[PDB]
Design a protein around this ligand. Sequence first.
Ligand SMILES: [Zn+2]
Length: 216
Amino acid sequence: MKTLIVVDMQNDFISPLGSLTVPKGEELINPISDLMQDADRDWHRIVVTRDWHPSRHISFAKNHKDKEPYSTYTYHSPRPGDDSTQEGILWPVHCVKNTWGSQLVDQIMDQVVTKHIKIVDKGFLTDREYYSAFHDIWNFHKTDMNKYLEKHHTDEVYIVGVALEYCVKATAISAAELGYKTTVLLDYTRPISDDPEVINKVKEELKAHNINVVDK
Ligand SMILES: [Zn+2]
């Protein structure tokens, strides 16, 4: 069956007042809301995701001495005895659990609450970044997503939301890797970077993993 995953439509990413506003982010709210309600699409399930950080999260520059927001940082595997590392970005503080910032934008919060839509929180563990809604950047800790998708007989997955080049792409990749037939409806996403070339880079990576990208 088809499932629709709506990635991080949250205040801190969508509101101008948010701490990590995606450019033209507000343009997504109504179209995504329509998408969520559209009979023709035959969504068997819809899942929405939230970045859900503790305030002391490792991914915020505020939590590293002598490092400012948007700097490059080297994460170290939290697995004891694992010494591999990954390059990261330290961000402004965003999506702290139970703060305006981390709420789904109202138009979507209202849809979730009135239609009882599954929420998946990612980014919860203090000690690691997660871009994908499926699992952390190490693929150590998994979320709920896959078991939920399976319970509801998902064979294909449609992904929308923000940010295109971080959580949208990472979520799409996980899904393809787990064997779902995966789609990104590009018209319903936006990048954090408002460099036009970014949409091509992601577009090409997506296709390399047999994720298929369409506009609408
Ligand atoms: Zn985050």
